[PDB]
Design a protein around this ligand. Structure first.
Ligand code: GDP
Ligand code: K
Length: 308
């Protein structure tokens, strides 16, 4: 029979659950969301179908007060509830803001549980703005390292990079949605990859081969049309200004190209060469293609890059 991969997204702490709420608002089908927090007031406002309040004995329903040991102990003491919410997932994305008490301490525990439950486990986490100061940055760094030890693959977004994509008036929430896009489009690209049978078919086992026990990762999508569409879509897929880990140095890549019946062999090679050239390495590519005739002149390039 056919395989039906279960994808879950888990928000851990305030920033993580913020990202979950905004992704739910944007709309996202066939993904299950789990909200995990110490802060009962925030959790009450979560849109997630599955909510886990952790650490109530430790915090009396408050946040962790910037103490990552409390976040860690809260998650460990709710291990069974976390296991029960995860059970059945083939893939888990853990999103969290590093530098506070709950995200920094609980997110690596959640990631460890997911991996021990058999899920392919991806972290997507932020580092604090420099204006939040050195102690927050240093706590966040310890969280990042703990995440790296617990996940299969880790995507880090330094919040300082948001200062590169705003003008003096861009609302903070609009900036936050740009960071959200990294996780949302990564999840959606995998979901679409699994849902469709491709002319050159990639599936969840190929995702596992590229992401399992790899470390840093890049996940990107590019869309373009018209002249030079394949090159432009490929460049967009690999060129986010928000990432700590760029494409440079990638040694493994999963690339899927979707287009209409006009999709040419020549432009598929162009797109693949863009990614190889940018990595500046001998890349082990897993290459796929999907013909969607509903598409007209549009091409979509999806990239997952690892092996750094
Ligand atoms: N990009 C982004 N960063 C956030 C958001 N919320 C919080 N942060 C960042 O995440 C860090 C931890 O905040 P938070 O998740 O509320 O802390 P915790 O719940 O106590 O673990 C902060 O220091 C900020 O750098 C958000 O919605 N988007
Ligand atoms: K497929």
């Amino acid at each position: 029979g056919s395989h039906m991969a279960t994808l879950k997204v888990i928000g851990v702490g305030g920033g993580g659950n913020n990202a979950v709420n905004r992704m739910i608002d944007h709309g996202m089908n066939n993904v299950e969301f789990i909200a995990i927090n110490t802060d009962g007031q925030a959790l009450n406002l979560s849109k997630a179908e599955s909510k886990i309040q952790i650490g109530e004995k430790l915090t009396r329903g408050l946040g962790a007060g910037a103490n990552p040991e409390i976040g860690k102990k809260a998650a460990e003491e709710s291990r069974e509830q976390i296991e029960d919410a995860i059970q059945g997932a083939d893939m888990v994305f853990v999103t969290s803001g590093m530098g506070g008490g709950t995200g920094t301490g609980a997110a690596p525990v959640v990631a460890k549980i997911a991996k021990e439950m058999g899920a392919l486990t991806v972290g997507v986490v932020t580092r604090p703005f420099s204006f939040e100061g050195r102690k927050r940055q240093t706590q966040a760094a310890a969280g990042v390292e703990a995440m790296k030890a617990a996940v299969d693959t880790l995507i880090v977004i330094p919040n300082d990079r948001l200062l590169d994509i705003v003008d003096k008036s861009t609302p903070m929430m609009e900036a936050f949605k740009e960071a959200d896009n990294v996780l949302r489009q990564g999840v959606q690209g995998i979901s679409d990859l699994i849902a469709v049978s491709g002319e050159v078919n990639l599936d969840f086992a190929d995702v596992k081969t590229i992401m399992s026990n790899q470390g840093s990762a890049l996940m990107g999508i590019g869309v373009s049309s018209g002249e030079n569409r394949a090159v432009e879509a490929a460049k967009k897929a690999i060129s986010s200004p928000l990432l700590e880990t760029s494409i440079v140095g990638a040694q493994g890549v999963l690339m899927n190209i979707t287009g209409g019946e006009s999709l040419s062999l020549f432009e598929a090679q162009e797109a693949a060469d863009i990614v190889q050239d940018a990595a500046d390495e001998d890349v082990n590519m897993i290459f796929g293609t999907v013909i969607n005739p509903e598409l007209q002149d549009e091409i979509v390039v999806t990239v997952i890059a690892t092996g750094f």
